Each structure stands twice: as C-alpha cells, then as structure tokens.
Amino acid sequence: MLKNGKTEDLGCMYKLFSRVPNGLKTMCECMSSYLREQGKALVSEEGEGKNPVDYIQGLLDLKSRFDRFLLESFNNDRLFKQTIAGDFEYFLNLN
16 A cells, blocks of 8 residues: 555554554554665666656655655654654665
C-alpha cells in the first residue's frame, strides 16, 4: 500500500496499529525503509547523469510524496513525521 498509493488502507492499518505500543514504530520503520531506499536510489547518480526531476530536486518532491503518507495516512503523527524528516536529512545532506 505504500507503493500502491491507496491512502484509505494505510489509514485503516494506521488506526489499527496505533493502539498496540510501537506498532506505530513498526510502521515508522517501514516508512524509514521505503524512504531511505528511494532517496538513496535517487541521490546515487545513475548512468551518465541524472535529470533534476529525479536527483537535483526530485528529492524534495519525494519528500512531499512521503509527506502525503504522513498527513493523509499517518495523522501527521510525531513519530512518522520525525522518521520521514530524518530520512530527508540523511539523503539530503548528500545533495
């Protein structure tokens, strides 16, 4: 559902995992995995040059893309927004 873009299902599973302690942390770790993977792929220049849409400024767009998951599906929660902002920092310090 993170690659599907279905925010309804992400919200339902967020509301189910909120009650259990650190189930939200399970989702936050999955978010960290997804965002770190995609950002590391983007920052790592591929081929003979990377277009701005992917590397130079595609990183900001991807940060907004995962912000979409944060707001719509993860309630703007402190843990999820913190994790995505951390991934932002990690693979933006290289940009």
